Structures are given as C-alpha cells and as structure tokens.
C-alpha cells in the first residue's frame, strides 16, 4: 500500500461468491426440480399495488444484507409466473429444456458479446454451425444469417434488406425523393410487420393486406391484384411477407404458389416462420412450409416451439455475396480471417450468443429428438381436438393446421340460445372472466383474444413435451368448472 | 392407458436435472471462483480452423451422452475469452458482479417475457423502479422509458421518437412525400447513429457532423451553423444527438450549451450516455453530464461501467403523456387489472427480457453509495495509469482523459530516435496490431487498439472492474513494453 484516492482491492469476494452458489440452489430447489410438478400453482396472483408491499423495490443509498437479498430472490421466484409449469399455455413458448438452460447459465457467467471472433471465438463458430443447419432444414444449398433479439426484429431486418436490395442507394439518400415503397402481407400477420413499416420510414398506410381464405391462408390470386393496383397507383412494390404459422390460428400461407407470384414481378419474398419454422425439423409436418426453399429470406424463433429459452430468433438469407454486410456495414486489419466477424451484419453492436443454447439442445437430442418433440405436440394438439368435439359447450373455430387450438367455451346459460348479435355480445365476456379465475387459482393459464370479426375465444398452444394427455383433460375439466355457472 | 399417436411421457427428467446441477457446479469451480485469479490465461487462442477441429460442432440426427456433453461445456469455457478476468480491457465492459450474475441466473431459469403484468408481474415492477431511479440521476422530475437490447437500439428508438414528435403522421404515411429530415451529431459519435439513419429510411447523407475541438467535444458554435445551412438547403432539422462519453476517447459534449441551441430552434435533444451515463452515480464526476436534465431523451447502458452483464441498455424520455406508447403502438390483440402496468406497446420489440432486473439486484446489494464508490475507483485507476504512463518512456499519451478511456501509443525503441514525420507514423501503425497479436497468443492481456478520425493505430484502455489493482496497471505497461521492446 498505498495511493490516492486510496487503493487496495476493497472487495468481499468470498462472500459475494456464496450468493452465486446460494442462488444456484434456489434455481434447483425452487425451479428446476419443481418444474414438472403439476401440483404447483402456475402463478401466485397479486395485483400491482399489493405486490409492491411484498417485494421492497426501493433502491436506497445503502445496500442490504445477504439474508435480505436472498429473501428478495426467494420472493422473486415465488411471485413470478411459472413458464416452465406444464399447465402454462398462455404464450407461444413454455416448458423448461434442461440442456438449453445449462447452456443459458454458462453464457450468463462468461458474459460474452458477439462483436468479433477475438471476443467470442466459440460462440461465433456455433452460430455458424446452427445457421448452416437451419439453412439445410429450409432446403437451400447456401445462405447467410444472424441471430436477432426477437423474430419481430428479424422481420424488420428482412424488410430493410429487401429495400436495400431494391435500391441500395436508400442507405445513403434515404426515402425523401423516392416513390412509395409498398410491401404486401396477410391480415393474419404478426403486428411486428406494422411496427416495422413505421420504424423503417415506410409507413403503415403502405402495408397492403391481402385477403385470406377460410383457413387463414393468403390468397395468391388476390396478391396479383394488389401488385398491379400498387403499380397503377404509381407506387413501387418491393416485398411480400408470408407467414408460415400465424400467432392466433397458426395458419400456413402457400409458399410455392406465392413464390410463383413473387418471381413473375421480381419481388423479395420473406417468410415469417417465427412460429411454424420449427416444423421444418419434422419430416412428417415440414410440408406445412412447402416451397419455403423458393423464398429469399426466412425468420425462425427456436425459443418458441423448441424451448431454446428467451431470446432466440434467426434471420436467414438466400445470399452468399455478403449482402447482409453490404446492407449493415459501418465504421470501425490484422491478424486473422476477419471473415469470422459479424459485427457489421446486424443493427446492434453488442449481442448475446442466443444461438448457443439452441446448439446445446440440438446436440443433446439430435434432429431425431427434436423431430419427436414437434410431432408429439401435434398429437397432443389433435388429442385435445378429439376431446373438445366430444364435449358440449366447447365450439371449435376450425381444425387447427398447427398446434393453435382455438375454441369458445359456451356456458350452459347461453346454450339453446340463437346465433344472433345478442348471443355473441354475451359470449364475449366469458373467456375474460374464465381467465380471471384461473389466474387467481393459479391452476391454469390460457390466452383469450378477439381476431378478425370473431369475438373473445380461447387459444391453446401445446409445446412442452412434459404436457400429458391428462393435462389436456384437466384443461377442459378446469375451464368447464369455472364457466359452468356463467 | 397408453394410446396413439405415440404417448407417454418418456422424457428422463432426472438426467436433465443432473446436467443443470452439473453445469451449475462447473460454473462455480471454473468461472465464479477463478474470476479474480490473475495468473490464469485471459484467453486460449486457437484460430477458427484449429478451434473448429477441437469442439466438434456438428449437429447430428442422434444426440450425445451427458459425459460428452459435459465435456463440450468444459471445452466451451476453456477456449472462450474470460471477460471477468481483471486483466481484460478489450471492450467497454469487463469483470464479474456476483449479485447481477445471481439475478442473471434467476431470470435465466424463470425464462420470462415482459409482454405485460399478467406474464411478468415482478420484473415489470422492477423495471418501473429502475427507470424511475435512473430518471432521478438524470435530473428530471418525471419520465418514461423502456429497456432495449443494446444502446444501439436505444439510439434508434430515440431517433424514431424525435421523428414521431416532429411529424407523427410519418408512422402512417411514411417519408415518401416529406422533405429531408436531418439530425446533427459529433464525429466522435457511435456508429449506430449511421446504421440508425439508414435503417429508419432517413439516409446517412442526412447525418450532419459537427466539428469537434481539441478535447473531442462538439462545438456549439458550429451546431448553430449546420442548422441554418440545413434549413437554407430546404431541409428540415429535427434531432440533435450529443454523446456523453464517446467510445474511443471518452469525451463529453457540452450539454448545457448544446441544449441552449436545441431550445432556440425546437429540436429534440438526445444524449448517447451509453458509456458515460454511469458517471451520474458519482457526485464527483456527474458534472461531466451537466445539463443532461435539459435534454428530451437519454440512453444509458449499465452493462458497461456498472457491470450489469450483457445486455442492459435503457432509454429514458422526458415525457409523461405516453409518447413512447403513442409512437410504438400497434394495438394488436380489457380488464381486470390496471393495464397501465403493461409495456408491450412502448417498444419496437414484441417479446422482451428483464434486462433491468440484474441491475436492480446490484443496486439493492450495493446501494447508491456502493455504485458511486465503484465508479470513482475506476477514475482513480485511470488517473493512476495516466500518471504512470507519463513516468515511462516509449508511451505517448494522446491527451488527458476526460473519462476512463486512456489512449496512448507505444513507440518501440527503434523509433524513439526518429523524427515526427509521415514515415514515423506509418511504422508506428503496425506496432499495436503486432503487440496485440502476441498478448493474445500469450493469453496474459487484452486491450483494444484502433485508428481514429485520422490518428493512426493506438491503444485504448478502459477501467471498469473494481477487481483491477495497481499491480494490474503496472503489469499493463510492463507487459506492453516487454512485448514490443524488440520491434
Ligand atoms: C412470435 C412471432 C413473431 C415474433 O415474436 P418475438 O418473440 O418478438 O420474436 C413474429 N411473427 C409471428 C407469426 C410470431 O408467432
Ligand atoms: C458502448 C456504446 C454503445 C453500445 O451499443 P450496443 O448496441 O449496446 O453495443 C453505443 N454508443 C456508445 C457511444 C457506446 O459507448
């Protein structure tokens, strides 16, 4: 010693290291080992103003003792939704993949960023591997891609690419003097298509929506109409965005008949497979994405159907001439193959190795194990279907094309009624009220939402391979019980 | 009963439960407990084609037994860079905060998304807490914000906000019929300002750069000049982006004199404090961002100076009328709780992680006082290395640092008796890349070297981790000197 302004190490490491070991056990005791126990509440509901009185969130000038901090962690787990609980069907993700989680913890400790090979050599070789594999599942011989934070941004990137490819001078000039650029998507499209059009300075008014048929599928005959009208307005079409697996219904646009339309006019074709993309793993169901190999770009989120954990979404491009680079290049030599850097393919600088956790799963299960996981979801989906039809008071909107089982629950008081406006206006308030109860019970969680002209209906999503047939029987047994007297 | 179309389960949990327990212990033994040990290699260098031949990355139809898988994890750590090693100064982050890691692991197991209160009640109350606290450090009375994946997106989001405020019809009509929108930033700005300008359909040609003085600081007299020229071209200025802590030099634009220029013309003022933002925690050094409370929006990444872990970047807005919402809304789908506590329509993202929770865990564990002291020690260690660099010969300092960005050349002995002419620089250029090549093969150090705005290859040092000691600074210069003495 010493110096100014006072030097040493000043740290209480060996204690702070225990807090990490103690947190690890909380994960094991209170999450990992209780992950498959159906006998636990999916959520400990407490309104906002009551949960504030339970957590002590104020960050004061002084710290808190290790006991008080371990209490917070004890509570943070107790009061949060259990996304791993087998009875969690509230989102397009659920369950706990043990192998992806172990990889997830690793990434957290190393705390790597994927600027370049010199900081993340392993994880950059893994992203190369995963992207190459995914590109095979699509059917391309070569390609290119990056991992974005959420398939929402993946679509944004693909929209920005289709604009750069159409007129790469937009990167420098901007859109001031350019005519109206127009993209075409289905009205069943994710809403990130809307945020994107605005964000990229294209405007939501320039997102032409193509009519869908009775199954939620885009109609390629109409698309030709919308592309000629756009031109005849003086506007410049440049992109078509189909969806292979919508969020609500799980529909699958016909990519082979859309590709034939995009190729007649030379328009980028982007397929939003954030949800249905994982079906490409199954030889049995990968036909849902027939013709995807004719698109120019594909979005795919493994954190959904394959339980990679949040976040994990990839954008794949059919190019190999560094178009990704040519589009996202900016400022910044020796001494290694600089090709293995990717800092200038993305809009972000820092980035986490989202693709590594998936790699850990694919190694642990192989394509064969992932194939079975996707296929089983379809079985459990179609099982719930067969059981829903047996019951009265459960109306199915349609046979699902994916694992999105959309149905109403009609209480007995509303049966023998007539299919008129007055009937719907009352059926509307059923799902939201059945959701209020199952959230206070902590025994179930399903999504309710309107769609198109349809009023509040349920959407069920089978993903986790811990779900059992008995978890589907309980779904209908539970909803029935909570809405029997409504 | 058992029946069609193939039912069970048949998952073999108890194995998957070991792999998690075994990985947890692997983390403890080989990372957490070895975090501060300086005598270990900062990195196990192996080129791609040799590291590819060592990891076996191929994803086959079949899986691999847990023993090979536990080997994989063992190798991934052995060959990866140790960002927690105290002698890691290669980027604007480093070190291991044990408390943020515990929070990182917690978030990791729950695997939550922050759509709404019904999915992430806790983490939404935590994000409200952090945002409110941060907004005080800025000096605002009230505000609004969200956590983005990386300060790059924070700048992108703030730039899109200023455009919505300037003409909110751009959200629907777009930019087709509108005149040229122009923003003004410093040439010392992060490059996400260029990526953003392109991405948002504004165009890089419309990013006017204001000249910098000898300290790297924007010159408010020029800023006024560029706004009159821009307008006199028929173009429409709408945003000014100052930087409170540049990446290379660590400069701090003068926010009070820039704000006065933005207020005379009614232009959004955005401060890129992704790096220097953490200085607001220090009463001594928070003067570097004097006048930030006059800006309309602030970006601030705790995953850097405060060691929150990646990723963690916040966008703060001076509004309270749900401008963030009004701008990033797509009301795509009501009782029975206060929907105000949802944030799904404030972001450009749909799904989102609780980046702010790990920081909250640190602030709780250390208090504002602990965060203040950690920031100050970095400043001291910076000024120590500075004073030590001047004592040594062969080390030329580009300038006195305003932050913890210590930029210096290393002049091998062969070039110390030369003259300060062109040929001198041209040879000095290849010094840093070759001194970096060795320390990466030695595995004993990692700091960044880069050219800059006409300066030739020089080193950049970033003091962050409070595990760094004077002995880690003396070794920095002793090591660089040793590796380049024979050049
Ligand atoms: C889930 C989804 C997205 C994007 O989801 P993120 O979690 O934001 O990545 C986009 N489109 C569809 C059809 C989706 O299901
Ligand atoms: C570190 C830094 C950033 C970081 O952006 P990321 O996308 O989070 O990596 C942006 N701007 C400046 C000035 C920075 O120092």
Residue numbers in the entry:
A (entry chain B): 11 to 342, 349 to 502
B (entry chain A): 11 to 343, 349 to 502
Give the exact sentences the study uses for this entry.
PLP-dependent decarboxylases constitute a large family of enzymes that catalyze a range of metabolic reactions. One such enzyme is glutamic acid decarboxylase-like protein 1 (GADL1), which was originally named based on its sequence homology to glutamic acid decarboxylase (GAD), which synthesizes the inhibitory neurotransmitter γ-aminobutyric acid. However, GADL1 has no reactivity towards glutamic acid and therefore is unlikely to be involved in GABA signalling. Compared with CSAD, the activity of GADL1 towards cysteine sulfinic acid (CSA) as a substrate is much lower, and GADL1 has a stronger preference for aspartate, suggesting that GADL1 may be involved in the biosynthesis of β-alanine and its peptide derivatives, such as the neuro­protectant carnosine.
In this study, we describe the crystal structure of mouse GADL1 (MmGADL1). The diffraction quality was initially poor, with diffraction limits of around 6–7 Å and highly smeared reflections. By optimizing the size, the amount of nucleation, and the general appearance of the crystals, the conditions given in Table 1 produced thin but nonfragile crystals that allowed structure refinement in two crystal forms to resolutions of 2.4 and 3.0 Å; the higher resolution data set was plagued by significant twinning and pseudotranslation. Thus, the structure of the nontwinned crystal form is discussed here; essentially all features can also be seen in the twinned crystal. For both chains, residues 11–502 could be built, with the flexible loop common to PLP-dependent decarboxylases being absent from the electron density (approximately residues 340–350). The overall fold of MmGADL1 is similar to those of CSAD and other close homologues, with a flexible loop, not defined in electron density, from the apposing monomer covering the active site, which is possibly relevant in catalysis. Importantly, a large part of the active-site cavity wall will be formed by the flexible loop in the substrate-bound state; the flexible loop is invisible in most PLP-dependent decarboxylase crystal structures, but harbours a Tyr residue that is likely to be important for catalysis. While our GADL1 preparation is enzymatically active, and the crystal is apparently fully occupied with covalently bound PLP, we cannot currently rule out the presence of PLP-deficient GADL1 in the purified SAXS sample, since crystallization might have enriched a cofactor-bound conformation of the protein. While the molecular mass calculated from the forward scattering intensity accurately matches that of a dimer, the theoretical scattering curve calculated from the crystal structure differs significantly. The shape in solution is more elongated than in the crystal.
